[PDB]
């Protein structure tokens, strides 16, 4: 499709809406233009969703409990409020970890204060204090507690900071109050910010003047990798093969001690910019730790990232960098040789959260595929600046896409593959369009690093080339 055909498509789709929604949604849809690099000249982002239009977004509690805090493995995270939020989010996200669940690790469990109407009437602070003691009795190897506020907490005027301070001092225990009520902000995005500030305020400073830990020149932290299907582990291996020492993973497979040690590192390696740029900036401000954005999707980006990271160190790491790249060269070359011919020329539309809608484009390109549309639930304009340089000329960009819009764009553009979420998957499959979940990896992965690229390629191929897609039309119709 030409730029004019795409712009016309936008206007046709918007015809359905009442005037106020139409005027709003027009601002959140754009056609990429190489002459225009400032996204604040072509798209609005990180605003409220329009009522009744079937946004795909979640809330601040998802962003804090589900995304940042939940993966920390040796803490207990309380879903504080009524029973729904913690139940729907229990083990939905594949933030992988090593531990003994219910004993020293708690990730896939759902701890809650199960608010009843009496807790709305009288407040939940007394219940929270009691709940903390019961946690301590029944889960003695927990290394800390977080309190992930659901909608009612702030609305009824509870004081979870006071309970956290008092019980923390009573028990010599790290107890973190998190005001991630889903009424706050407009999406998961503000939850990340709230969560980062909670780490800052209640955890990160704990070892500030503690210099027990023996540092080396090669100490780094992986910031903003939640280890989906083992993504952080297939990243870590490469960084350590290159001669670096990965002191911390924020927060996939993350322990509270490794978070507390992070102020000792020499360099913060930021994968997910959206969710963890806040604490990265904090650590630079306060501890003088530089940070840098990288990308471990596909061989092209992975190689570029390893070289850029190694350049921050000395000749010994730069040498090990080249050793790593030579080791894996035959492996990813064999993946390309097998799968690129089976995928080349095929067109993809993506819709994901805050990073992957731009970050995975290189990996598609490494298999000869073309990303013809992309967009985000909750990204900001700094994300869209980055996106416009990774995406092709005249491609479709969509912020906080509505159900209706996504469906209608797909029917016109007719992509060969869609990469999006669980609420999207079954819709597109029925239309006869190969779909891959690009949050959960469709229960596959890892997709990060060289070992991840093989799995990514296998997966795009098994789905795009599957025999089921030739069978949707009955031969008598």
């Amino acid at each position: 499709m030409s730029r004019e055909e795409v712009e016309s498509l936008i206007q046709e789709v918007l015809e359905v809406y009442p005037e106020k929604a139409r005027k709003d949604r027009n601002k959140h849809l754009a056609v990429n233009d190489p002459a225009v690099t400032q996204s604040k000249k072509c798209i609005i982002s990180n605003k409220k969703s329009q009522p009744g239009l079937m946004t795909i977004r979640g809330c601040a509690y998802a962003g804090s409990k589900g995304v940042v805090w939940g993966p920390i493995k040796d803490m207990i995270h309380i879903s504080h409020g009524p029973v729904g939020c913690g139940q729907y989010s229990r083990a939905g996200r594949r933030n992988y970890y090593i531990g003994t669940t219910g004993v020293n690790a708690f990730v896939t469990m759902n701890f809650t204060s199960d608010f009843q109407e009496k807790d709305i009437v009288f407040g939940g602070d007394k219940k929270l204090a009691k709940l903390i003691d019961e946690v301590e009795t029944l889960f003695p190897l927990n290394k800390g507690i977080s309190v992930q506020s659901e909608c009612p907490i702030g609305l009824i005027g509870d004081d979870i900071e006071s309970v956290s301070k008092v019980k923390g001092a009573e028990l010599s225990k790290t107890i973190v109050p998190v005001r991630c009520e889903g009424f706050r902000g407009v999406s998961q995005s503000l939850g990340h910010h709230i969560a980062n500030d909670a780490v800052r305020d209640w955890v990160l400073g704990k070892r500030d003047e503690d210099t027990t830990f023996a540092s080396t020149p090669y100490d780094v932290a992986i910031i903003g990798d939640y280890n989906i299907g083992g993504d952080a582990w297939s990243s870590r291996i490469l960084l350590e093969e290159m001669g670096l020492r990965c002191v911390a993973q924020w927060s996939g497979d993350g322990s509270i001690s490794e978070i507390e040690l992070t102020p000792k590192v020499k360099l913060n390696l930021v994968h997910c910019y959206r969710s963890m740029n806040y604490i990265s900036r904090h650590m630079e401000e306060k501890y003088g730790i530089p940070w840098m954005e990288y990308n471990f999707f596909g061989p092209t980006k992975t190689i570029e990232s390893l070289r850029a990271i190694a350049a921050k160190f000395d000749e010994s790491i730069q040498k090990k960098c080249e050793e790593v790249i030579a080791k894996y060269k035959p492996e990813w070359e064999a993946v390309v040789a097998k799968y690129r011919p089976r995928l080349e020329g095929k067109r993809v539309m993506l819709y994901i959260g805050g990073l992957r809608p731009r970050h995975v484009i290189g990996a598609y390109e490494d298999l000869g595929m073309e990303v013809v549309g992309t967009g985000y639930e909750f990204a900001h304009n700094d994300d869209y600046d980055r996106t416009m340089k990774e995406m092709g000329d005249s491609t479709l960009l969509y912020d906080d896409v509505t159900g209706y819009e996504f469906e209608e764009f797909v029917k016109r553009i007719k992509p060969d593959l869609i990469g999006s979420g669980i609420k999207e998957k079954f819709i597109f499959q029925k239309m006869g369009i190969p779909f891959r979940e690009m949050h959960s990896w469709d229960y596959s992965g890892p997709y990060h690093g060289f070992d991840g690229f093989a799995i990514f390629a296998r997966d795009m191929d098994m789905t795009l080339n599957n025999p089921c897609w030739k069978k949707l039309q009955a031969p008598w119709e």
């Binding site: 809406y17 409220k48 969703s49 329009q50 009522p51 009744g52 239009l53 079937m54 977004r57 979640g58 809330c59 601040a60 998802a62 040796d74 009524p82 029973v83 729904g84 939020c85 913690g86 139940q87 729907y88 090593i98 003994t100 020293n104 896939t108 759902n110 701890f111 219940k127 009691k130 019961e134 009795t137 029944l138 190897l141 009612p152 609305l155 889903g182 009424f183 902000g185 407009v186 299907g229 083992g230 582990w233 291996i237 322990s255 490794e258 894996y328 492996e331 209706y404 469906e407 609420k423 998957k425 079954f426 029925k430 239309m431 006869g432 060289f450 070992d451 799995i455 949707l472 009955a474």
Partner: protein, 522 residues
């Protein structure tokens, strides 16, 4: 590393030596992990009677609940109506979770909107959200009906749904005649099943309260059927199939079986099938109304008795032999239709299957959980099979329900070692299957973590999960199954007996050790 002609996902990739060594160094370097002997010590303690006693003294902490919140049930109920959009007034985070939860169980699209109330509504309320939300939803998704429920922030703020909806019509956001039934669905009261009851009663009242003057009980010669919160497609299908076979006129009020099973033929269908607005308007003219799941339809029942003047029969859920018999006999009485040869034969086929399988089922001990009506019907059928339902857990049960189940247990010798638990969660159940080990669990996918825990103690302590309930996320297409009627009983019997025989095969597969009992014929 990867070998291209045999690519490894997470399992078993991370069992390669280089990954194992890397994870060991991460642990030893940076995780400040408790020593393994201490982890083993605490694990063993969590399996003890002493720990169980502490666990059962909990008052404030809930761990691994076996219930969800009201609006999820309101959404399921609303999906069963023709061209109806479920619409939850309040916070959009809730609706992402409701959709996803049902998406994972049915492996289908689940359509639902929010009106995206934000922090600003705490000053001024959610009225403008309701006006714009209804207008936008109607225009964009072209439903014929919008069925409104609430999230917990709308409830705490105290938004008046009735006034908001009336004002939306008065000010021209939607046509006056466009149907917008509503129910308040506070997550901090009851559970998802209460949300279902609330939503249903709201839709019943919308279409019938103001128009009762012209109604005559029995004048349409049909029986209304209200299914409640129901997540097996086969359950809606079997009820309609049995009534049709009997030549009984009926109206199934809330019927999502089409919208939860659209064909993959090249088009997405946002809406399919469903109870018609005309069926709800005409429902007071029925002979009577039967509630398939009465222990969560109390509010519906009061409306049907108080306004429609139907003599709702005192029937248990039609699960197992006796209760299916009772349901068919009551339908025969109301309708004046005899039970047909076809159902009499089906019944005797179920009984045949019971005689054929009774020796392997006899005395088998089960732990089980779910919603109240489902749990009580499973208990009843287990007693009919000569099984012992020793741990019966209903997190969202109440005292009157427990008494009813305790009476059923007391009427059978197979109930002598059984205890019914209410308000207890799957962390409570975990203790019970350690301290008083049963043969199997019957439950939803959250049971898998209890099976994992039991195996960790030892193979001889493992309690295998048999997946019946909601949600089932880790197996495919089990939502197509049936648990009601003779067909459902046939399916449950087959699943149980074959689970027993799978496990016996496992325990007797050991060459020259246990395979003396690895029989070809069982």
């Amino acid at each position: 590393s990867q070998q291209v002609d045999k690519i490894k996902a997470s399992y078993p990739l991370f069992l390669d030596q280089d990954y194992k060594d890397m994870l060991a160094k991460k642990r030893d370097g940076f995780e400040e992990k408790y020593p393994q002997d201490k982890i083993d010590e605490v694990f063993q303690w969590t399996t003890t009677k002493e720990y169980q006693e502490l666990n059962f003294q909990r008052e404030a902490l809930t761990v691994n609940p076996a219930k969800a919140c009201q609006p999820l049930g309101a959404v399921l109920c609303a999906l069963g109506f023709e061209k109806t959009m479920p619409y939850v007034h309040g916070s959009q985070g809730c609706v992402a979770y409701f959709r996803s939860y049902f998406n994972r169980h049915f492996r289908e699209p689940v359509s639902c909107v929010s009106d995206s109330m934000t922090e600003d509504a705490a000053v001024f309320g959610g009225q403008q959200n309701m006006k714009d939300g209804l207008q936008n939803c109607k225009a964009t998704y072209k439903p014929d009906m919008i069925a409104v429920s609430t999230t917990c922030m709308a409830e705490v703020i105290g938004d008046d749904l009735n006034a908001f909806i009336n004002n939306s019509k008065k000010e021209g956001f939607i046509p006056d005649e466009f149907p917008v039934p509503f129910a308040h669905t506070p997550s901090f009261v009851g559970s998802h099943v209460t949300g279902w009851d609330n939503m249903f009663e709201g839709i019943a009242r919308y279409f019938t309260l103001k128009s009762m003057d012209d109604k005559v009980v029995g004048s349409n010669k049909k029986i209304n059927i209200v299914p409640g919160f129901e997540t097996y497609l086969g359950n809606f299908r079997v009820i309609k199939r049995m009534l049709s076979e009997m030549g009984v006129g009926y109206s199934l009020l809330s019927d999502p079986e089409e919208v939860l099973d659209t064909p993959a033929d090249g088009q997405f269908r946002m809406y399919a099938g469903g109870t018609t607005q005309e069926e709800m308007k005409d429902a007071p003219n029925a002979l009577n109304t039967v509630l398939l799941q009465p222990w969560h339809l109390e509010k519906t029942k009061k409306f049907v008795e108080g306004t429609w003047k139907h003599e709702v029969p005192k029937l248990n859920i039609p699960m197992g032999l006796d209760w299916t018999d009772e349901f068919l006999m009551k339908v025969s009485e109301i309708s004046g239709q005899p039970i047909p040869a076809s159902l009499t034969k089906e019944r005797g086929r179920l009984v045949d299957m019971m005689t054929d399988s009774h020796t392997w089922l006899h005395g088998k001990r089960f732990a089980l959980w779910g919603d109240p009506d489902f749990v009580m019907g499973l208990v009843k059928f287990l007693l009919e099979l000569g099984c012992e339902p020793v741990h019966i857990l209903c997190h969202n049960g109440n005292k009157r329900w427990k008494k009813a189940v305790d009476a059923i247990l007391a009427a059978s010798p197979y109930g002598k070692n059984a205890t019914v638990y209410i308000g207890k969660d799957l962390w409570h159940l975990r203790s019970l299957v350690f301290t008083d080990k049963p043969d199997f669990m019957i439950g939803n996918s959250y049971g898998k973590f209890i099976q994992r825990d039991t195996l960790h103690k030892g193979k001889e302590f493992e309690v295998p999960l048999i997946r019946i309930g909601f949600p089932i996320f880790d197996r495919h297409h089990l939502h197509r199954s049936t648990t009601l009627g003779y067909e459902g009983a046939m399916q449950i019997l087959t699943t149980l007996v074959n689970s027993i025989l799978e496990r016996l095969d496992e325990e007797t597969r050991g060459m020259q050790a246990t395979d003396y009992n690895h029989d070809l014929v069982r």
